[PDB]
Amino acid sequence: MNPKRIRALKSGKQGDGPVVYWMSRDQRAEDNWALLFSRAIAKEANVPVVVVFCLTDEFLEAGIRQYEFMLKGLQELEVSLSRKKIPSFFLRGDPGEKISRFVKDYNAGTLVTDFSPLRIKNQWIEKVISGISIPFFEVDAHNVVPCWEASQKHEYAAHTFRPKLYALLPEFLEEFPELEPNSTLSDVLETGVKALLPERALLKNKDPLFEPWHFEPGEKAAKKVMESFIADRLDSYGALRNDPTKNMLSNLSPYLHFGQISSQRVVLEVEKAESNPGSKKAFLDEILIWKEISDNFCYYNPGYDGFESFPSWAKESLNAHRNDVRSHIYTLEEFEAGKTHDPLWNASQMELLSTGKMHGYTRMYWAKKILEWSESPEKALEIAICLNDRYELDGRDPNGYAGIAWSIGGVHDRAWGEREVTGKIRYMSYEGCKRKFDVKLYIEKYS
Numbered sequence: 001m002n003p004k005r006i007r008a009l010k011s012g013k014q015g016d017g018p019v020v021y022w023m024s025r026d027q028r029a030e031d032n033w034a035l036l037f038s039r040a041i042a043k044e045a046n047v048p049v050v051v052v053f054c055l056t057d058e059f060l061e062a063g064i065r066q067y068e069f070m071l072k073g074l075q076e077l078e079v080s081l082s083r084k085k086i087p088s089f090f091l092r093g094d095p096g097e098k099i100s101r102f103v104k105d106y107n108a109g110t111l112v113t114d115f116s117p118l119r120i121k122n123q124w125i126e127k128v129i130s131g132i133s134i135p136f137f138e139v140d141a142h143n144v145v146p147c148w149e150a151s152q153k154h155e156y157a158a159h160t161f162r163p164k165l166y167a168l169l170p171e172f173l174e175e176f177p178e179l180e181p182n183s184t185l186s187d188v189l190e191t192g193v194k195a196l197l198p199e200r201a202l203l204k205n206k207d208p209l210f211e212p213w214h215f216e217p218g219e220k221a222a223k224k225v226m227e228s229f230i231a232d233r234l235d236s237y238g239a240l241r242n243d244p245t246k247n248m249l250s251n252l253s254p255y256l257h258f259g260q261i262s263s264q265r266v267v268l269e270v271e272k273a274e275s276n277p278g279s280k281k282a283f284l285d286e287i288l289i290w291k292e293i294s295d296n297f298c299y300y301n302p303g304y305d306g307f308e309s310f311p312s313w314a315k316e317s318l319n320a321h322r323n324d325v326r327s328h329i330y331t332l333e334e335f336e337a338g339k340t341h342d343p344l345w346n347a348s349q350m351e352l353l354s355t356g357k358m359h360g361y362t363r364m365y366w367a368k369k370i371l372e373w374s375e376s377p378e379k380a381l382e383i384a385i386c387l388n389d390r391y392e393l394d395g396r397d398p399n400g401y402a403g404i405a406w407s408i409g410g411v412h413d414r415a416w417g418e419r420e421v422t423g424k425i426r427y428m429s430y431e432g433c434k435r436k437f438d439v440k441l442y443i444e445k446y447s
């Protein structure tokens with residue numbers, strides 16, 4: 001219940017109404033700091049807390065793979081909130097109009113939301129802040145250490161963010177107090193899929209390319225995945241994290257992006273488990289440093305998805321190599337269907353198209369080749385963002401924009417050997433990947 005997790009967006013006349021928690025990023029009932037704070041404020045006001053979720057008009061920019069995963073978890077979430085006598089309301093439309101009307105209609109007393117440094121979340125905040133008079137609060141329920149508390153500026157590298165984050169771990173890494181009780185979605189899903197059906201990803205015979213049996217949605221499935229990762233996969237994480245032929249990753253990203261499981265709950269469970277110190281240190285670096293530095297990248301850089309947020313050395317190196325003749329130039333549709341001359345690159349595209357989750361190691365290869373085979377670094381940014389946000393189940397996430405900015409613009413990275421086209425950006429060759437893992441085995445799986 002650390003008060004540093006709370007931030008004030010707009011002070012106003014405190015109403016004597018039910019506390020409305022605006023759920024956006026953390027779609028879960030257990031281990032939610034935003035949901036717990038709203039219940040704590042509700043009790044002090046002798047008012048009942050409620051949960052609201054907004055189904056926005058931007059869902060048609062993605063695919064059914066993300067829509068179904070999110071809505072199915074919300075169906076489970078509604079039942080869980082009903083266990084604690086917490087009514088959940090789902091609105092369709094723009095949050096600026098829907099949240100303002102719901103607050104006025106329900107005579108809400110306090111408004112609470114979860115933290116998201118993305119631009120579209122900031123867009124909805126400005127509209128809502130201009131249409132309400134009740135107090136507005138936001139809570140970092142996604143990071144172990146609050147985004148504004150870990151660092152007050154943009155961090156240039158991970159070796160400067162790591163000591164800052166670990167110095168606050170004894171304060172913010174704590175257990176979750178219980179959510180004490182308050183003392184149709186199937187129809188929306190049906191019409192949504194009907195609107196997204198014309199743009200469904202299909203192969204030649206019109207069979208759907210997506211396979212939805214790899215990651216089942218819901219808060220329940222995330223816990224079983226977490227338990228299976230610790231017992232079965234945590235020991236070999238340090239030595240097999242970069243081998244895509246083996247499914248040794250944790251597979252928590254689709255659940256983490258939608259907030260179906262708390263990352264802090266993962267850290268708390270991993271810290272107790274007795275495993276290889278090397279593997280535990282490698283996993284904690286990914287879920288604590290790189291995950292939360294990604295939120296830091298989106299929170300302190302308004303242009304996190306543009307060439308303007310690259311480091312100065314990368315901008316100068318890429319600019320000096322703009323006129324360099326590219327070995328090949330593929331358009332967006334050739335990249336979408338895996339029509340390149342690198343069977344390793346396409347093999348990643350098939351895995352992304354069929355499973356919605358490309359391996360972490362091949363994700364770096366995938367994003368850097370788009371830089372090599374595009375007209376400008378800016379057009380590489382657009383294609384990488386477009387492909388990642390359309391087909392990744394964990395897409396439209398600060399991890400994506402920071403991850404893409406890492407591969408193409410060398411954000412949170414250092415300069416390497418000067419090359420053509422790519423300049424000083426870290427290079428990854430087809431020769432180097434064969435020396436690290438069985439490339440042919442990865443290719444044959446995704447053909």
Ligand SMILES: Cc1cc2nc3c(=O)[nH]c(=O)nc-3n(C[C@H](O)[C@H](O)[C@H](O)COP(=O)(O)OP(=O)(O)OC[C@H]3O[C@@H](n4cnc5c(N)ncnc54)[C@H](O)[C@@H]3O)c2cc1C
Binds near residue numbers: 251394
């Ligand atoms: C170009 C590019 C784009 C990416 N786009 C996304 C994205 O849109 N959404 C997304 O969630 N991840 C993205 N990743 C980050 C990373 O690849 C994934 O988080 C990770 O692969 C997710 O699968 P996992 O949980 O089974 O891997 P694990 O090895 O099990 O990692 C566990 C968790 O640590 C975090 N993590 C791991 N690697 C990174 C990383 N490089 N940066 C930040 N956090 C990390 C993730 O939350 C991850 O769930 C991207 C990486 C790159 C290089």
